[PDB]
């Protein structure tokens with residue numbers, strides 16, 4: 191029935207909406223673990239939010255508990271500090287601090303505390319009986335670390351990697367004085383690791399770059415519909431996180447917030463989310479204006495990556511609204 | 518219960534303040550509210566005021582009341598990032614339950630017709646008993662009323678409980694052109710502030726940063742609303758505070774405080790804090806200290822009762838309990 195999945199995320203709002211999608215769809219996904227990286231959040235906050243959401247869901251829908259580990263990966267280029275604070279706010283949301291759920295997390299916290307994110311990813315994959323799908327909604331540093339340490343012994347156990355990252359035929363979202371805006375943030379955080387992943391042979395990769403994520407901006411109308419399901423803990427949770435993003439486009443002309451990681455996780459639940467196109471992907475790692483950019487390379491026999499195209503937005507929007515009703 | 522009118526500018530503490538005043542029907546009869554385009558975008562701030570009112574009306578004995586948008590304009594606008602918080606609340610699921618949004622949609626046309634400043638003037642003056650004005654945004658609207666009606670307006674005011682200024686502590690307006698002595702609410706419109714604090718015949722209770730600095734919004738307390746998720750107001754208040762606990766780390770010590778909430782608590786119950794009389798003047802000049810509240814030696818200068826040593830635990834318990842109103 192369900193396939194094994196590990197969520198490799200960096201604790202922002204869409205990372206958590208992504209978590210809820212994967213966790214709530216028990217018929218399609220068997221969530222066997224998660225790791226949080228100190229990228230688009232402060233790892234301690236992301237770690238606790240991951241734990242709190244898991245416990246809330248364990249008590250309300252019998253979701254099997256799984257290991258959560260903090261990655262030791264460090265940044266090449268850190269995310270803006272303002273974005274990394276979001277996990278802190280979520281750690282304090284009343285919906286994630288219900289006594290029975292917080293009590294459970296407190297009971298299993300010390301154990302998960304002992305895990306090192308990167309080694310955990312490698313063990314969950316390599317020790318799994320069946321192959322494992324890795325959903326990467328943060329930087330690629332952990333998959334790369336596993337690839338460098340274990341090579342084929344690791345990749346051969348990977349069903350596929352579904353990745354939120356990049357921008358192939360559309361501009362990126364990294365706008366700084368020294369960049370040209372063609373790079374996307376997850377790749378930009380650790381270019382070298384991304385390149386390692388995208389160049390790895392014997393590894394299936396599904397890539398959700400901005401080309402596809404640009405079709406799902408977070409808008410008020412849709413977000414307010416979660417207000418129709420306040421009887422469900424996950425709807426209060428998902429709607430709240432989304433409600434915290436509807437201002438972005440207004441704050442930075444058009445450079446709004448999108449359901450990046452959410453759309454990516456949705457594909458893991460049901461590939462009908464989008465079709466794909468094979469593309470040889472390389473990553474600019476030098477200190478150039480487009481550092482972090484994902485570009486097609488025509489190097490001989492370069493491994494292919496399946497780039498998502500023309501996502502089924504309506505299907506995705508209905509999936510999220512109904513998944514937020516699992517409990 | 519005494520008649521109260523909330524004069525706010527739509528930020529997170531403004532809304533918690535609103536909940537505090539509205540939920541305590543035993544001490545406060547909330548007869549109206551106005552929102553100013555200051556620390557929010559008036560449309561979002563107006564709409565959230567409406568959404569909160571209807572949520573409460575439909576779940577507890579809270580009479581509906583008029584809500585108006587102020588025509589006041591800024592001298593020095595708030596930071597855009599801060600003004601977006603009302604847009605965020607506007608889309609929160611707890612404020613978008615069908616039954617409450619339907620009510621709001623139904624009474625909206627009546628309220629979106631009121632002019633905030635005139636509404637404040639009419640509510641105060643035509644009231645049978647005297648009215649207490651809780652000001653949690655700039656002082657533009659009370660000044661407008663003073664300018665237009667003078668004594669006819671002030672004589673009907675029980676007292677103005679104002680969240681604003683900094684007297685013996687550093688302010689919180691940190692900009693390239695400022696020296697940090699000014700507090701945001703006064704800074705937004707110095708001249709209106711000057712008018713109110715220099716008004717003879719008007720009683721003023723001032724909650725300056727001197728007292729609000731004892732109430733930073735911190736994680737441990739915020740998480741306690743998690744023990745009350747069966748009450749809509751706890752989900753609402755806890756969610757708003759949860760969106761503030763980050764400021765201290767982001768702004769190196771310059772965190773978020775329960776500024777307007779503390780001010781409002783005192784209206785509910787004065788045991789919240791004692792007061793010291795102080796001649797409060799305001800700097801309106803385009804200097805590095807524009808918007809500063811300073812003691813003046815001028816003879817016959819009207820006194821203002823500045824809050825001192827607030828009862829923190831008392832205030833904190835009041836909010837948690839009030840948050841269980843529904």
Ligand SMILES: O=c1[nH]cnc2c([C@@H]3N[C@H](CO)[C@@H](O)[C@H]3O)c[nH]c12
Pocket residue numbers: 202203204205230273327328354363374375376438446447450451
């Ligand atoms: O404006 C933003 N706020 C918070 N996170 C992101 C991101 C993060 N990077 C990825 C998309 O660029 C996605 O995983 C998301 O969590 C891009 N822009 C923002």
Ligand SMILES: O=c1[nH]cnc2c([C@@H]3N[C@H](CO)[C@@H](O)[C@H]3O)c[nH]c12
Pocket residue numbers: 528529530531556599653654680689700701702764772773776777
């Ligand atoms: O960092 C901030 N974010 C949002 N609002 C405020 C304020 C507003 N100004 C008053 C306190 O200085 C109070 O009414 C509050 O709503 C000061 N600092 C901030």
Ligand SMILES: [Ca+2]
Pocket residue numbers: 199200201202204205230327328451
């Ligand atoms: Ca992410």
Ligand SMILES: [Ca+2]
Pocket residue numbers: 525526527528530531556653654777
């Ligand atoms: Ca305010």
Ligand code: NI
Pocket residue numbers: 574
């Ligand atoms: Ni009614």
